Design a protein around this ligand. Structure first.
Ligand code: NAP
Ligand code: NAP
Ligand code: NAR
Ligand code: NAR
Lengths: 334, 334
């Protein structure tokens, strides 16, 4: 009955969100960059079996190309995002495109006239970078009023700086635009996302949350960096993320931005669990021993306050199906 | 101006509840077993400088003795509770009298005819003892549907068994009674309570949370027992518990039982924080190193879903003032 658009149907979170929407009885429209690439989009034919799913070609770099996909939709889930750290001139190759691609899609929402709410998928990368609070030696609970320090990041350009800046600025810009055109925009801010999805060529979070099993050095360094900063990592099941996105679309009183997170283990806790549950990978939990650090953690309360309920609540439930996904994707060798 | 009764004004939580009630403009009646004991009850004189405070004598074993104190009260906070010392017949000396004493006070609430709500202070001792969830080696999140297993406890009588059975049965019987007599009963279930209160003789109530600084062997054993069971401990600040109790009395939609908890450190996290903030006590965090264990934790969501907010959200804030209190009580030498 109601219709929704999901940008980046070939993506990890995008594919999972399409599945939820179809299961929930939505007509769905999704965009990919090359609808003919079955290497990336073989899942779309399968998803079509669950309900009305229509595929469009669109590129965030190409103005107006989202017009057709967004037309008629009651809800638009802005999931697709450049990402890809690369380097060189991040300001012109990551940040500016990130901002413009977002406004590109926003304008299609205005053109459609039908869009009752836009859900923007951002990231706690736009929340956590508070150099006043990291390194003061105290614990902190960061909430939705916390914004990553764009000025400090541009001045000092630490690792992943363009990523946090991209997210902060595209969120601010989309909110300004939504303000100006009287469109309702809600933003969700996930932590590390765990779990299986329809997408056949995903990597993204799966590499990181599986890095103790694969030994992938980039993912391992990412996990250790988060813990050295926060004293913990933060995790959420992809299906809870998708349900939170739909919750925010459907509940009229939802407003502003929302952290989405459920379980906050130390790496030693996470490695201990993984080594017991999946001994075939040889995880050594002592590889992740660390002194206790003050906790700089994310508040889970806003979604809870507004009535949302997570279904994957223990560490084991958060890891209920990601290993098999990683195997199928070749991220894990067996 | 509404009027509220707190049973057991001499006690740790009771004195803190009275203080909050006066600050929020309530007239307060409280009970002690010997109003003439001004050593034990000096704080009640002090608190009278905040607002109307009236002391009554009453005893849970003495039928009717609470009549005068609850009379004319809008709300009644049932806080008083027996200390519980190893008894030859726990059923006859502890469990049955805990039920009867609770009913005794319930009756006085009915008799008053004015009691909008009764708030029962209990504890997660009535929640956590689950032979399946504790022994199955998996992580779990317990919520307010979880009750300690009275039959298993009577069958195997582990340590503290009588304390849990007492809490479970007295809560069940008080709800039975409240149903039949048409009086609203809400129950709060705190975890370990930390922080300063007005009571001058409350030594025994904060022994555990300071045991790392004091070396109190009984307190250390309790902390380790809980960690052995749950993989962590659970803490809440006494002032958040008091604020939660007031919230549950004042908000008509509140119903049933509520866990009250905020911060769940491992012992090594707790010890590390204490060692650095209060080095003068020679805490050795390595004394508390431990294997990562499946987390059997408490859900914090019910109070949050209903709009309550905690003010002591970091480990440091939860410990913001308890050390000075322990000095004043003589738990800590300096
Ligand atoms: N995964 C996590 O742990 C996590 C955590 C926090 C936040 N998030 C946020 O959630 C969003 C989706 O994350 P993901 O893990 O699903 O990443 P993903 O699998 O790489 O999906 C990203 C999608 O964006 C599309 N895309 C990129 N540039 C495009 C362009 N110019 N035009 C059209 N489409 C374009 C991509 O299509 P192509 O494949 O054709 O390039 C891809 O399908 C991201 O914004 C992420 O930052 C994720
Ligand atoms: N302290 C914590 O960390 C914590 C944590 C979770 C739950 N709780 C629960 O909160 C409740 C209050 O705890 P608390 O720490 O405040 O203990 P407390 O300081 O010992 O206060 C309990 C009060 O009960 C009174 N009392 C005992 N028997 C009585 C009787 N027969 N008649 C009248 N009064 C009687 C006592 O007054 P007398 O001096 O006259 O005996 C005492 O003041 C308890 O049920 C506890 O189980 C406490
Ligand atoms: O954008 C983010 C945020 C990042 C993060 C998590 C926790 C934290 O405290 C800080 C940053 O984790 C991620 C992990 C991914 O695989 C892909 C992502 O896009 C991201
Ligand atoms: O009633 C309880 C329950 C106990 C507890 C906390 C957490 C847990 O997981 C299990 C039991 O903590 C306490 C600590 C006290 O000083 C006094 C108490 O009366 C109690």
């Amino acid at each position: 009955m109601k219709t929704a658009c999901v940008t980046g149907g070939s993506g990890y979170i995008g594919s999972a969100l399409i599945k939820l929407l179809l299961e929930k009885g939505y007509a769905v429209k999704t965009t990919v960059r090359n609808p003919d690439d079955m290497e990336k989009n073989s899942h779309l034919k399968d998803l079509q079996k669950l309900g009305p799913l229509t595929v469009f070609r669109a590129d965030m770099d190409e103005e107006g190309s989202f017009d057709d996909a967004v037309a008629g939709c009651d809800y638009v889930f802005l999931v697709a995002a450049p990402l890809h750290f690369e380097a060189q001139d991040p300001e012109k190759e990551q940040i500016e495109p990130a901002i413009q691609g977002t406004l590109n899609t926003m304008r299609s929402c205005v053109k459609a006239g039908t869009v009752r709410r836009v859900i923007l998928t951002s990231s706690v990368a736009a929340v956590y970078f508070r150099p006043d609070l990291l390194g003061d030696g105290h614990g902190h609970v960061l909430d939705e009023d916390s914004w990553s320090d764009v000025d400090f990041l541009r001045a000092h350009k630490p690792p992943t700086w363009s990523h946090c800046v991209s997210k902060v600025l595209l969120e601010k810009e989309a909110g300004r635009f939504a303000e100006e055109h009287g469109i309702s925009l809600v933003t969700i801010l996930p932590v590390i996302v765990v779990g299986a999805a329809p997408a056949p060529k995903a990597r993204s979070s799966i590499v990181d949350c599986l890095s103790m099993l694969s030994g992938d050095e980039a993912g391992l360094a990412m996990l250790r960096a988060i813990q050295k900063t926060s004293g913990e990592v933060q995790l959420v099941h992809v299906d809870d993320l998708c349900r939170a996105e739909l919750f925010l679309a459907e509940n009229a009183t939802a407003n502003g931005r929302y952290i989405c997170s459920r379980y906050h283990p130390t790496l030693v806790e996470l490695a201990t669990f993984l080594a017991q549950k999946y001994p075939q990978y040889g995880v050594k939990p002592t590889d992740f021993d660390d002194e206790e650090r003050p906790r700089v953690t994310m508040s889970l309360e806003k979604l809870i306050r507004e009535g949302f309920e997570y279904k994957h609540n223990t560490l084991e439930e958060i890891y209920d199906n990601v290993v098999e996904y990683g195997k199928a994707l070749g991220i894990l060798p067996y």
